[PDB]
C-alpha cells in the first residue's frame, strides 16, 4: 500500500519537539504537494498539513510542515499526551493519484510506573458452557515491556495464553495489558491454584496475584 518511507516510530517527552520525515522520489514528493495526517487510535486520518506547510482551520501552530527535494518533514512542538497517534504523509504520484507513507507511531516518554495487577477467575456462566478463561490485568504501567507468567498448581504454563496491550493512554501515557489463560472445564476442575506472576522494571521484585478455584 505504502509508497513513501517514514520511520516506524519516534518518541520524546511532553513539552519537547519531534520531527517525522517522509522520503519519496522525484516523481512523487519531488513534483507534488505533501499532506500530513494524524490517526488517533480507532479513528479516521485527520488532516494536519496540506500544500507542504499550510494548516487547515482548527489545527494549532504546534504542527508544521516543510518539503525539500524528494523529502518532507512534519514538526510537532510542545508535545502533549494527546498527541500519541500514528502520523502519515501523503502526496501525488507521476499520474496525479494519491499515495501515502507507511505511518510513524509517536510515543510519549514518561516516568517509570509499575502496573497494578488483578486476576479474574472464570465466571460461573462461562463454566456452565464448558470452558474456563482466567484473565490477568496489568493496569497503567510504563514502559511497555512486561512479562506475565501463568502457573497452575505451580506448573508453569507455556503456550496456553494470549495477551494484548492497549495503545498509550491519551492522558497518562501508560499502557495496560490483558492476558487470558484458557482451559477446558474438566482441566480447570483438576487444579486448585491459579496464579499470574508479573515482572516489570517498576517492580523491585515480581508481583503474583492468585486464587484457589472455588474458594
Amino acid at each position: 500500500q505504502s509508497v513513501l518511507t517514514q520511520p516506524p516510530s519516534v518518541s520524546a517527552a511532553p513539552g519537547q519537539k519531534v520531527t517525522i520525515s517522509c522520503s519519496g522520489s522525484s516523481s512523487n514528493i519531488g513534483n507534488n504537494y505533501v499532506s500530513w495526517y494524524q490517526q488517533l487510535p480507532g479513528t479516521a486520518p485527520k488532516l494536519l498539513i496540506y500544500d507542504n506547510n499550510k494548516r487547515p482551520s482548527g489545527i494549532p501552530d504546534r504542527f508544521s510542515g516543510s518539503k525539500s527535494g524528494t523529502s518532507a518533514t512534519l514538526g510537532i512542538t510542545g508535545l502533549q499526551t494527546g498527541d500519541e497517534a500514528d502520523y502519515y504523509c501523503g502526496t501525488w504520484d507521476s499520474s496525479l493519484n494519491p499515495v501515502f507513507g507507511g505511518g510513524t507511531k509517536l510515543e510519549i516518554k514518561r516516568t517509570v510506573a509499575a502496573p497494578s495487577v488483578f486476576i479474574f477467575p472464570p465466571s460461573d456462566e462461562q463454566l456452565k458452557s464448558g470452558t474456563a478463561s482466567v484473565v490477568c490485568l496489568l493496569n497503567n504501567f510504563y514502559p511497555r515491556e512486561a512479562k506475565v507468567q501463568w502457573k497452575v498448581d505451580n506448573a508453569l504454563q507455556s503456550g496456553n495464553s494470549q495477551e494484548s496491550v492497549t495503545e498509550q493512554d491519551s492522558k497518562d501515557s501508560t499502557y495496560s495489558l490483558s492476558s487470558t489463560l484458557t482451559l477446558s472445564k474438566a482441566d480447570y476442575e483438576k487444579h486448585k491454584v491459579y496464579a499470574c506472576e508479573v515482572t516489570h522494571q517498576g517492580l523491585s521484585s515480581p508481583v503474583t496475584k492468585s486464587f484457589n478455584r472455588g474458594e
Partner: protein, 212 residues
C-alpha cells in the same frame, strides 16, 4: 456539520463482490468536488482505491481498476464502492472521503468500516463478566467473528479508567477481547456497571451487568 458514514462492517467470502455505501449528511452529494475511497489493511498504512469527480469522471488505482466501480446515487445522497472478486488481500478498513468544494483544502472522512474477506463465517460473541481502594472489573467478549466489536460502559456515561484491549485471534479461528474499568471499591455496592457490546457483523448487541 458535514458527516460521512460507511455502511456497516462485516465479512465477504473469497471471489464474491464487496459492496459498501457512504451516506453524506449536511451536504448535497451532487455539489461535491469529488467523493472516493481509501483503505487501510490491518497494521498497515493507507491505500487509495479511487475517486469520482463532480463531472461523473472516475479515476481508480491502476492495480485495482479492473475490479473497482464507484458511483453516486443522488436520491439517497450516497456514493458506493463495489470491489469484485475479492480475496483475503482486500481485508482492510475502508474509509469514504470527499472534498466538498474545489476551493476547500480539507476533505471530510467517514469513520471507516472493517471488511474481512474469509471463508470463515459470522459468529456473534458470548459476553462474560470479569467480576470485581480501587477495584477492577470488566467484560470478556468471547468467540466472535469477524472483527470488530465495540464496548462502552454505562451507555457511555463511564469513560474514565476504561481500557478496551485489542482482540486476539484464538486457535479456533474466533476472536476474544476484554474491556476493563477501574472504579472506587466503595461504589461496588451502589453503582451499577454494565458493559455495552455491539458486534455489528452479526447484529449482536448485549448489555451485560457486572456484579461483585
Amino acid at each position: 456539520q458535514v458527516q460521512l458514514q460507511e455502511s456497516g462492517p462485516g465479512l465477504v467470502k473469497p471471489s464474491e463482490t464487496l459492496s459498501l455505501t457512504c451516506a453524506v449528511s449536511g451536504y448535497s452529494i451532487s455539489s461535491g468536488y469529488y467523493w472516493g475511497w481509501i483503505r487501510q489493511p490491518p497494521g498497515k498504512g493507507l491505500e487509495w482505491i479511487g475517486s469520482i469527480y463532480h463531472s461523473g469522471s472516475t479515476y481508480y488505482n491502476p492495480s485495482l481498476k479492473s475490479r473497482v466501480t464507484i458511483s453516486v446515487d443522488t436520491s439517497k445522497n450516497q456514493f458506493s464502492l463495489k470491489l469484485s472478486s475479492v480475496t483475503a488481500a482486500d481485508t482492510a478498513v475502508y474509509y469514504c472521503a470527499g472534498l466538498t468544494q474545489s476551493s476547500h483544502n480539507d476533505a471530510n472522512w467517514g469513520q471507516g468500516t472493517l471488511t474481512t474477506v474469509s471463508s470463515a463465517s459470522t459468529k456473534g460473541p458470548s459476553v462474560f463478566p470479569l467480576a470485581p481502594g480501587t477495584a477492577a472489573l470488566g467484560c470478556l467478549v468471547k468467540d466472535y467473528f469477524p472483527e470488530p466489536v465495540t464496548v462502552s460502559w454505562n451507555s457511555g456515561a463511564l469513560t474514565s479508567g476504561v481500557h478496551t484491549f485489542p482482540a486476539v485471534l484464538q486457535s479456533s479461528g474466533l476472536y476474544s477481547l476484554s474491556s476493563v474499568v477501574t472504579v472506587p471499591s466503595s461504589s461496588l455496592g451502589t453503582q451499577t456497571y454494565i458493559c455495552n457490546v455491539n458486534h455489528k457483523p452479526s447484529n449482536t448487541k448485549v448489555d451485560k451487568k457486572v456484579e461483585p
